[PDB]
Symmetry: D2
Subunit: 419 residues, 4 copies
């Protein structure tokens, strides 16, 4: 069998490793999102179209470099490249825009960060990667600088030093997610300890059900070379096996000679590594650790993921306003793709932070009866799923919906046979 | 602690001290045993059905009303004794006692009628007396047949043929009573609706010290197959003459439930003994304590690991509903069912939540007592013009009956299992509902 | 051979889940190992004859219980003399001699604190060299201290097994177990003191906690009750015996079945037959894993050697673990890990040989030879005595692997060596 | 006792976790490694690392195995490198605290069958007393047989580590491992022969299968590649080293990093620092459980003793397992169960002392005292030599517990004894 299914059926983690097969081809869509830093080498609309086709899901703009005018032009070019595919709604791929802050430097929230965060709100950025977060009050300051109009921007705290690692729990509690910012972390703490901080933070984020990004020097040699080193491919695969929701490219896409090839390489490795995940142990441990809950979205999500594993469901189609119902499905790490049908263009972009969530932006005419409108949003997930290769006639899918309109009312799971 | 901290704050520490919940949260079976607490009171409705043999001591309509209130779910008529006239009178008395509670549809308790055959004796196949008794069963509308001395698949085919075209809906529970039945167990279970571990004959046919191995193996295989299994004979034997059982008898009843038995049975204890109602009350009291002591964490994990992948939407919905019920400590899983099958597939995963099965079939309401944790509710209203409205009314009937009987309280979460179109075989929906 | 792997429920032993283990239990898979759960038989008019006691020893009785709720001191002194005469009638064949413990079961406090009758009975016990006290109605740690004080300076070596018979004993279980040598789940009184339908919860909890503590636990009362008057037990009775062994009980007991009934020998034979079947049905894969996980780290060399020896025995399907012991402690530490291999304990202490019957899977052998001049030769002779005893009794055959547990110097407390030996 | 500080070091809070997810969540950058680094470092000797003075610094930095790549250089060039390694190694014979055996490994050029150059280079290896051959491009069992035949009458004791470098070697892995002493995951060629994104699958599979077989596995190529020109590695490189150790690799390797790079000593220091951190982060609770479950039952006393000793070491947090070995086999069987305790292997064979560096966690001590007339005294002298070396090196202190593994008679193949000692 394909997608490492012989290794998936193993009774121990050791036997699972023994059964990994280089000839077992991945079939599932690539789950781990790729964040590519946009810079001189990846700014043109033509280059950005190739990066989107190669697998870029989130465009990062590093406000440690360039200027407001430079980054606004990169943002406009990203949006032009993304919207060039909107003419085919069944295959359109949303792409998030993330602003990475310069940071506090010596000393709270710097004056440059206040201005850059305001720029982010004015330019409709989806995510903020907040540099050098070392305590909960740093997150509150970033949130306050985003103001009343930036209530919906996701804050991903970058852990870059010893204090951030030690105060991790309080930082994660108030953040939307975390970035393991290994460049500074590898200079702030001994280089030989970074893997411990990475594995601990990824594990704690997986436990919390919040997105975690692995970043910096993942494919470093590809800045000048067309192929990566053996350590670099291993690093990408191990970040996925660790449980990372996203993987990142910095100089590799911002200034390197092979930006598209770096994205293609992360896509190819992530897909292989996702199939090599030992779901039998991972699901059991995530399910045991996820606390008991009376929230119906929480209850429906675990029921849906259990049902998907029982029938080898090709996908879990979920309707979501904010992305939350898709995020609660993603936290259980289903092998089934989570196809999230949303009308919110911002939620479609932001949900790339959660592993295995494939956002579909709904642009079909509304139905007069709310129940019919729900059914056509589900048929839209099915038709997009068929076109993209997620679904085929005869497949089983799990459909997750709610009892009334508006966010917070997901409570239904259905088993549906395709076509 | 972190996996139950928020729910402990919401439901309270008292909730998590009842129904052996501290033992339920243990990380190992050894720790689970260490945490069993005699002060942790059972809260859930008793899920293992009680089969009471009806005879001289339990025949009157007045006595039968007391036995139904004490917990009898299935009335057994042993065709090894009495006659057709005697058993028909017992059946009429059971039906009169059962129907005396029909005036209140929101509290009515269905009771199944089971015919236990005399058996083949020294003959190789279906005896002439069994052919006549099986025909009596069909004519008197019995729900279940406990077929004596089943030794191979062809024995069950002969019982099925003797029930004729009008008895296709009767459940056949094969009684394993000898070495051959144990050795050919897999082929017998494949063609039967369920099994009875008939320990009286089994304990004479094989060494007495080996019966527990056969009992535990057959219960385990039935649990794996998702088919009902009954533990029978001498469970509370001393209660035929004494008001209280022995220490070995209470232990035996508790261990049959912990083994995984769907039903427990009383023979002479209810048929001829001096304390028929007290014997039913004792099995009810022990079964509730034992059900709470089941280590669901390992049982659910092992039932998932051993059960193969399934493309049947009823099976897929059932596992998702049981998983959802455990996540929120659901008070109940309400399921709509025509034949009982959707309730049976929920029961095979052994949820702690009561499975409230709403059905229009009076026979399916009686037969689902064979499946552990299924509480049948007979819906008597005529169909609504719009099918979706009819479905909704049946779910609301389950909620209202649940509140009236004490299964459900305001603020509870319930899991509701329904299908996408009318008719049997289309269950595919699981909903999480808050009781208001 | 392939036949080896079909016996003693070995197909069920290899299962990956407890559910599949149950599914693989086979009534045709015959038990091979020696019966490891000890049988306690209460002595009375049905079992007091010296000749009848010889039959009970041959049937499998390991511990004779004297119930001091019935009979005078004169009655119990005669019981002790009769038991000792029957036991010593087999001493002429040292390779097959079976030690038998004598346990004094107290009348209890009644309406009162240690009663004055219990003080007198406990002093009688010390004067007559009883090995174990089954202390009735233990409700708290101070009840155990009072029993220990009544045994005096000469009774320090007597084991105290606290009987849990009421709600207070169950609630104060942890403090009682801490100061006791072991526990008895005294189901007769327990089933009247608490609701009858709750006794199984108290039994399973106390057995589980004693298994975790590595201390002996006895399941008692009405196990084969109908055999007081009938030749065969009920289906519930055989199930109760099998389930007490599967629960983890070190010992099972007979009261009226051996003291006053018409089938004392048959009741012992029935418990022996059931216990042997149930021991093979134990899912050692999960049990060993959980006993290891729950047991804390230890710096005591006897315990460290014991876990290593039990792990080694499982690795090679060892026929036995032969251990030399002065007090029984090295054998008890092996027993707490529940090896499938029989623990053959060789000792010179007649009292330790009798007391180790409290620990499941310990087969005591009383060595009577005076010490060799060279200590290493004395140890070897005792190990060879264990091997010769085991071959004669059917525990061992040529070609079997055994684990041998000894210490680095004479005297108690110095066990620290485990060795893999081929039987020649 | 041990103290609270003891339980905060070497990732012991993460070690006690009940799940792998909880284990990851408990990894702590402030929990310092205490145990000696157990993953051997292989350094390729070339232009940048040839001088006797540079080799002394590489030995102090942690190099355990010197690799001579016969794809380059010549017989004269590599003989001079080997003589320089031996001079640097023997310069530490004046201090037991710094003297460490260093293996010499010959890596072949590679291949219709065995190339003429490989026949001559393998002959050079035998003539120069090499310990190990890393055989390039092994694709099937007959490739190993050809290398084994070329090692001739004098070199049958040389270990053959088959390098898996292409699709065929991965597909025929089981047959290759069966006849090889171990494996090298040769990622350079493997990453060109198969898609680059699949190398991690082949690495993890081969390491897992070698761990199951109890045979050494090496992770190789581009582990710290950027350190050829830079003083510090990339974040991907440190992660790659840590993950090779967490995967289960017995050895990690440096090629161009030490052969031609500007920072050979720093590359060795970096691998030592990472390996030590990664070894403490291994989740032994699951690893030991799975190695035990997957390993078949065994009647070999060395195998039975090894699992018992590793279980005993975990029970007491033993500072070390001291094993007497002539071939290295008894130490290899301890290593296969991945104890946290260091395996201190005392041997009179200088070749076995160098070769046991292939097995994770084995610390070789070459013993050179003349044999005692009384064999038990010769065994005791070697056990005490292991203890006194352990004390001098920082492995052991007075009051520590150690597990000691020996056999019942002299000669290889008789290991059957495990003892718990207490350091005095
Ligand atoms: O901080 C350190 O020491 C670590 C290295 C950080 C850099 N990583 S990056 O992918 O964000 C990046 C971002 C940028 C550039 C990079 O070359 C680069 O590698 C530019 O040349 C550029 C030039 C004009 C305007 C904007 C940019 C720009 O945004
Ligand atoms: O693509 C390939 O097949 C080649 C990849 C490089 C191989 N790596 S190595 O660490 O074994 C190594 C080995 C050597 C050298 C290396 O520079 C080098 O990186 C030399 O300059 C040298 C020069 C004179 C005599 C001997 C050597 C020598 O032994
Ligand atoms: O994931 P979220 O943000 O809670 O959104 C889920 C919501 O989407 C729905 O499925 C559809 O709601 P809308 O019709 O308002 O889009 C609701 O029933 C449910 O509450
Ligand atoms: O358990 P069964 O026998 O499959 O019955 C379940 C059936 O009951 C329903 O929920 C309701 O069906 P009806 O309206 O025919 O009673 C169906 O949608 C479903 O297929
Ligand atoms: O189990 P215990 O009471 O600690 O006895 C074990 C003792 O028995 C021995 O094996 C033999 O000791 P003796 O020669 O004194 O009988 C000692 O080495 C060891 O300390
Ligand atoms: O690991 P190996 O090569 O089998 O060597 C183990 C041998 O070492 C010993 O412990 C000591 O033997 P020697 O005295 O011959 O060195 C033997 O008892 C044992 O058989
Ligand atoms: O800021 C970052 O991305 C880093 O330091 O790795
Ligand atoms: O038939 C029965 O019920 C039996 O034998 O137990
Ligand atoms: O004392 C006892 O043995 C009892 O009450 O069971
Ligand atoms: O030969 C090697 O070492 C390689 O290819 O990695
Ligand atoms: K930045
Ligand atoms: K009958
Ligand atoms: K008494
Ligand atoms: K080479
Ligand atoms: Mg940074
Ligand atoms: Mg019968
Ligand atoms: Mg009593
Ligand atoms: Mg190569």
């Amino acid at each position: 069998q394909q997608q490492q299914l012989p290794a998936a059926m193993a009774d121990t983690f050791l036997e699972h490793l023994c059964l990994l097969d280089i000839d077992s081809e991945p079939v599932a869509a690539r789950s781990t999102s790729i964040i590519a830093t946009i810079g001189p080498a990846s700014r043109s609309v033509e280059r950005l179209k190739e990066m989107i086709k190669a697998g870029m899901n989130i465009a990062r703009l590093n406000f440690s470099h360039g200027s407001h005018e430079y980054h606004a032009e990169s943002i406009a070019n990203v949006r032009e490249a993304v919207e060039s595919f909107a003419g085919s709604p069944l295959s359109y791929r949303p792409v998030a825009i993330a602003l990475d802050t310069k940071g506090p430097g010596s000393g709270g929230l710097s004056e440059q960060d206040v201005r850059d965060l305001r720029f982010g709100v004015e330019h409709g950025v989806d995510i903020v990667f907040a540099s050098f977060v070392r305590k909960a009050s740093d997150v509150a300051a970033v949130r306050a600088a985003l103001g009343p109009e930036g209530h919906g921007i996701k804050i991903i705290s970058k852990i870059e030093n010893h204090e951030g690692v030690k105060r991790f729990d309080e930082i994660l509690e108030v953040s939307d997610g975390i970035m393991v910012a290994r460049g500074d972390l590898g200079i702030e703490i001994p280089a030989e300890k970074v893997f411990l901080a990475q594995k601990m933070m990824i594990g704690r984020c997986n436990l919390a059900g919040k997105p975690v990004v692995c970043a910096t020097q993942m494919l470093e040699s590809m800045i000048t070379k067309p192929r990566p080193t053996r350590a670099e491919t291993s690093d990408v695969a191990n970040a996925v096996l660790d449980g990372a929701d996203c993987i990142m490219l910095s100089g590799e896409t911002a200034k390197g000679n092979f930006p598209v090839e770096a994205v293609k390489m992360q896509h190819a490795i992530a897909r292989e590594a996702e199939a090599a995940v030992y779901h039998r142990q991972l699901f059991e441990e995530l399910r045991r650790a996820a606390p008991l809950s009376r929230d119906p979205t929480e209850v429906t999500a675990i029921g849906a993921v259990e049902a998907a594993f029982k029938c080898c469901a090709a996908a879990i189609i979920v309707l979501t306003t904010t992305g939350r119902s898709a995020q609660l499905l993603s936290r259980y790490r289903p092998r089934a793709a989570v196809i999230a049908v949303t009308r919110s263009a911002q939620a479609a972009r932001q949900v790339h932070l959660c592993r295995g969530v494939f956002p579909l932006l709904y642009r079909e005419p509304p139905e007069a009866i709310w129940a019919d409108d729900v059914d056509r949003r589900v048929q839209f997930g099915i038709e997009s799923g068929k076109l993209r290769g997620f679904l085929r006639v005869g497949d089983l899918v799990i459909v997750v919906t709610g009892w009334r309109p508006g966010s917070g009312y997901t409570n239904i799971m259905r088993v549906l046979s395709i076509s």
